[PDB]
Amino acid sequence: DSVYVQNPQIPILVDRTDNVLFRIRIPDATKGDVLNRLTIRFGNEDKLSEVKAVRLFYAGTEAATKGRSRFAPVTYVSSHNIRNTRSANPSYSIRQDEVTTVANTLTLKTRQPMVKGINYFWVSVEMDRNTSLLSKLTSTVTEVVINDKPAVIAGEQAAVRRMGIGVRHAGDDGSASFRIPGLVTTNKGTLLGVYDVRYNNSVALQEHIDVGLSRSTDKGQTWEPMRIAMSFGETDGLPSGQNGVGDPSILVDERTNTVWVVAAWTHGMGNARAWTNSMPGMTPDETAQLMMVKSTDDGRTWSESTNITSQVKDPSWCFLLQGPGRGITMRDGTLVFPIQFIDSLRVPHAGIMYSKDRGETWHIHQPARTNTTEAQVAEVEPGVLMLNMRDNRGGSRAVSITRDLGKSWTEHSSNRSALPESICMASLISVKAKDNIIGKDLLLFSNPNTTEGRHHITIKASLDGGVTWLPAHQVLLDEEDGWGYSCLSMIDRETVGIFYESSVAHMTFQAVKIKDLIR
Amino acid sequence: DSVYVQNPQIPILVDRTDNVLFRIRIPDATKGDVLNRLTIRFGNEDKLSEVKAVRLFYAGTEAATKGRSRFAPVTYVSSHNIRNTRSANPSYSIRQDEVTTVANTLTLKTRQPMVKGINYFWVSVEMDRNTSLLSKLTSTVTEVVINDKPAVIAGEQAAVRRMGIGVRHAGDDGSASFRIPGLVTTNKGTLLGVYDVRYNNSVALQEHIDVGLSRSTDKGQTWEPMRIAMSFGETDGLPSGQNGVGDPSILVDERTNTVWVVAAWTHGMGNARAWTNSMPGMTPDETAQLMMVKSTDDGRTWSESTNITSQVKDPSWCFLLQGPGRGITMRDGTLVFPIQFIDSLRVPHAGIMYSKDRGETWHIHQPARTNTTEAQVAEVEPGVLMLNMRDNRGGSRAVSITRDLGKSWTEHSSNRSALPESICMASLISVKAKDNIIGKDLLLFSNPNTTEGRHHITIKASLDGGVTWLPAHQVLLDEEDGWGYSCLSMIDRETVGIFYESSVAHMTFQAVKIKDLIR
Ligand SMILES: CC(=O)N[C@@H]1[C@@H]([C@H](O)[C@H](O)CO)O[C@@](OC[C@H]2O[C@@H](O[C@H]([C@H](O)[C@@H](O)C=O)[C@H](O)CO)[C@H](O)[C@@H](O)[C@H]2O)(C(=O)O)C[C@@H]1O
Ligand SMILES: CC(=O)N[C@@H]1[C@@H]([C@H](O)[C@H](O)CO)O[C@@](OC[C@H]2O[C@@H](O[C@H]([C@H](O)[C@@H](O)C=O)[C@H](O)CO)[C@H](O)[C@@H](O)[C@H]2O)(C(=O)O)C[C@@H]1O
């Protein structure tokens, strides 16, 4: 009979006990058939001394109504189960074999009698906790033996597998979930990742939500314990569940290395979504408040929050907040945070908010585009800001240019064409020629590369200021289902970091060589 | 202004830290208004020595879009949060005052400045863990002072509150949820309650599900630690997630005091629902299997499972299983378990399965009615079996009679008329005249007393063999939302037990005097 193999392009987490290397479907088994041996081969230059162990699991059969093309009956390693996100659910997968000394050829064994029809097995890889985030595996199933006969192998399994690290898992420090990533590199090379700490569940404001921060001084190989960057606990004697703060955006003031976090504080509003329940006005009791904290010590400690609402919110707006992810420093020292507001008629608009005085005062001019929400901004050329926007019309990112900090806007050539989306947050950054190994100005963009669902998390690079995104200049990181938000920061001259919601952890960090993007 | 009070008809659990006694809405507060004190009065005959503590909580305000007639913005005490089902979520409710020695008059205070518009407070009652299940509280909010003026109190708050006990809470013994209650009284007066232990989540078979059992030798004041009555773990080397057993039904063989549990074992079927994925055949690999265990020691220990599929399942049926809840012993010693089968055309039918030989052999004859599922059976008069059925047409219970153990069936006068339902499991039992204090044959019925959703869990009594269910002969136990399944058993001559899925715990036990049903 014929055997099918999948090598899923998902991150192998260095901090996990189990990671799916291969999924295998045996579609047409006779009752009693036994998978005696499976052989995997790794590429000659793979660093197999970083592989702690490889495992073969059996996961039984398929439901009668689910057809014959799936590679599994269920998620093998959960990213949501607060009681276990790090190993295979033992109730879905039974270990058959384990090898703890991994060579270029590897054989795994089973004595499990198969059921009639579909049978599922899969290969777990466990990595050394100190595995280089830049390391890659090129693994293939080369032989599968059933009843002492080699079987015909089919399936696309030629993926070059990448490493990652689960910075936050569901359930960490008692929190149900973590959402809405932001990432910057400080002037010291320190990585700062921000996110919602969603304690009770995974719904947005209003709820019990604080802004968490994870700090790495070693390019993401290690992360310090979670800091609360921003929190309103029981302000004015209202429950913490009616005092949430979230959808954070973080920037480094590149002139001072002062780090800024802006977030939306909801005060009251029962247990309902702020998106529909934030109302016109200015006071905390009336409307969502635009709040900021700062760190003068490379993200170790955080100021008390300052309320910036009165400086920038039109009273008639239902809701003003930051675009989640990150802000920028411009070449002339202006600090810029993307923003979004819901007007009196409940129409959302993306725009920008800027400070020319090191974050003392903030200003908003004109919206970029009707019916847009979350946006990220890059200085594509000197004094020239590119706004890349989530568009409620569906299908594709909106792209506008301002050269007057949003007093006026022009559509970009790439607007509503060049970058597919499913209506989801996306990351965009600029990289100066002198600041990277290619020696050319780059734009780097990340989002779920699809018009439906949130999957195929992809980094794209542009060499012509975001006019063109050539297919060759793209790295697929995560082809499976997630919440889809992502944020990019250059780690060093050679490597871009991505902090994102993945199929494998709520907050996932990966590092990618620029030379893999632009060959 | 004007203040609104709710006294919700939900069980006060003796094992909980918090129970909602009163919910209060202050609809039209001015910013800064303060609830200086509210006074509660308890009835003259209340056993206040059993009240451990009373608490006043503030829960903030309401969402602008959610209207002005709710009594809360959120569930105050969760029945689903595996991390806490026993106390108020501290993120939704802030304690204002607390009294730990309770008199007939009681004053609670706050210094919380209210927000403009809607403000929510509520009163928690905590009972001594040894509080009598038969105790009742008659409590009223008699005074509410705001800015040192008495306010006008409105609302229905005259409810006579009853006690109950949370036998199983979400998260107990590591299990995500508990569902599908069954209850019997052994010849020794011992209460035996069965249920699905749904480890991973709350979905039906197929999943990692065992049959749990809780035992009480003191009329439900105490429950012995959970026993696994039936389990298939990793049978044939298939995951425990593809070896679930559930939807249990329990009966006591009144002649021998041998206790029987029947359940559906699903083997394989991926991670999909057995209702649509169980297929024709006879083997465990082919179709859901009918399994039975027994206890000869009053439910302390349980036999290994016997497979009775071959005796009673037509090969062409997609799915044969017990009707969840309980079976009976007839006056002539016949053991009867309600059953249901899905035929070759996917049409479900309710019927009965019986043993005349102490459970050695089982027989099924003819279905009672097309497009029915879960049913419970009672011997309403000698040799006369009433089958009460969940009906997919909606709105009302189907009721049929057999005098020949299901060879033939007659429609009852009460069919599709007398008993409202929303398509949900219901409990029906018979009580002999000599076996209860009323000295008359009773039928007792429990279900969610509604045509939409699952709420208003109500015990109903009939004096005329289920022809008439007079409104006067009904007790409302739970007016809030739950999963709706229930099972009745007489505890003694004077009191009926109900083991049910409630708004306050996955498995809830309450005891009700017959004299409260029939006055
Ligand atoms: C302040 C604010 O509301 N926050 C942001 C919202 C924002 O509402 C929109 O940009 C406005 O148009 O976008 C996000 O959440 C809102 C959506 O959540 C959906 O449910 C899940 C759920 O986010 C997840 O957490 C499971 O629990 C997802 O669809 C994931 O696929 C709901 O269908 C809607 O409420 C839907 O509006 C988003 O993810 O897009 C996250 C962000 O915080
Ligand atoms: C063997 C078997 O399947 N078992 C029983 C099924 C059975 O399928 C039906 O009697 C046959 O027609 O009935 C139960 O589930 C069937 C429904 O469950 C509903 O979801 C309820 C929720 O109570 C809902 O009603 C909100 O109020 C859950 O609690 C979810 O966790 C689904 O929404 C339906 O689509 C539907 O699938 C039931 O509870 O009725 C559970 C029982 O074990």
Author numbering:
A (entry chain A), B (entry chain B): 34 to 552
The authors write:
The NanH sialidase of Tannerella forsythia, one of the bacteria associated with severe periodontal disease plays a role in virulence. The C-terminal catalytic domain is preceded by a 160 amino acid N-terminal domain that is a CBM that our laboratory discovered is capable of binding various sialoglycans and non-sialylated derivatives but has no catalytic activity itself. The NanH catalytic domain (residues 197–552) folds into a characteristic 6-bladed β-propeller catalytic domain, with each blade being composed of 3–4 antiparallel β-strands.
Using this mutant we produced crystals and determined structures for the NanH-D237A-apo protein (1.7 Å) and complexes with 3-SL (2.06 Å) and 6-SL (1.90 Å). As might be expected, the terminal sialic acid of 3-SL and 6-SL are positioned in the active site of NanH-D237A with their carboxyl-groups (C1) co-ordinated by a hydrogen bonding network with the arginine triad residues (R423, R487 and R212) and the N-acetyl group hydrogen bonds with D280 in a similar manner to that seen in the NanH-oseltamivir model. The pyranose ring sits in a distorted boat conformation, while as a result of the D237A mutation, the C4-OH group makes contact with R231. Of note here, when the 3-SL and 6-SL structural models are overlaid, the sialic acid portion of 6-SL occupies a near identical space to that of 3-SL with no substantial differences (≥0.1 Å) between the hydrogen bond lengths connecting the 3-SL and 6-SL terminal sialic acids to the conserved catalytic residues. Perhaps unsurprisingly the glycosidic linkage between C2 of sialic acid and the underlying galactose is in a near identical position in 3D space for both the 3-SL and 6-SL models, a phenomenon also seen in other proteins — such as Influenza A (HA) — the only other sialidase structures with these substrates in the active site. The galactose of the 3-SL complex is perpendicular to the sialic acid residue and pointing out of the active site whilst in contrast, the angle made by the galactose to the sialic acid in the 6-SL structure is different and directs the galactose into the central cleft of the enzyme dimer. In both cases no hydrogen bonding network could be seen between galactose and the protein backbone, indicating it may exist in various orientations. Of note, there is no displacement of W308 in the 3-SL or 6-SL models in contrast with the NanH-oseltamivir model.
